[PDB]
């Protein structure tokens, strides 16, 4: 008797959004950012 669809929808949305927004040009920035950050060592 719980609204599982709420959590499922929310999570699913964030995931789909993140991916779609990731495959975009944002990937470049995200990549460089992480890379450089790890380069510091």
Curated annotation (Swiss-Prot):
Region named Linear cationic cytotoxin domain: 1-41
Keyword check for Repeat: no
Keyword Lipid metabolism carried by entry: no
Keywords assigned: Antibiotic, Antimicrobial, Cytolysis, Disulfide bond, Knottin, Secreted, Signal, Toxin
Transmembrane segments: none
UniProt tissue specificity: Expressed by the venom gland.
Molecular function via GO: toxin activity
Any single Gene Ontology cellular-component annotation: extracellular region
Any coiled-coil regions, as ranges: none
BP GO annotations: defense response to bacterium; killing of cells of another organism
Function according to Swiss-Prot or TrEMBL: Has antimicrobial, insecticidal, cytolytic and cytotoxic activity. Active against E.coli DH5alpha, E.faecalis VKM B 871, B.subtilis VKM B 501, A.globiformis VKM Ac 1112, P.aeruginosa PAO1 and S.aureus 209P in submicromolar or low micromolar ranges. Lyses human erythrocytes. Kills HeLA and A549 cells.
Family the entry assigns: Belongs to the spiderine family. Cationic/spiderine subfamily.
Domain notes: The presence of a 'disulfide through disulfide knot' structurally defines this protein as a knottin.
Name of the protein this chain belongs to: Spiderine-1a
Organism: Oxyopes takobius (Lynx spider)
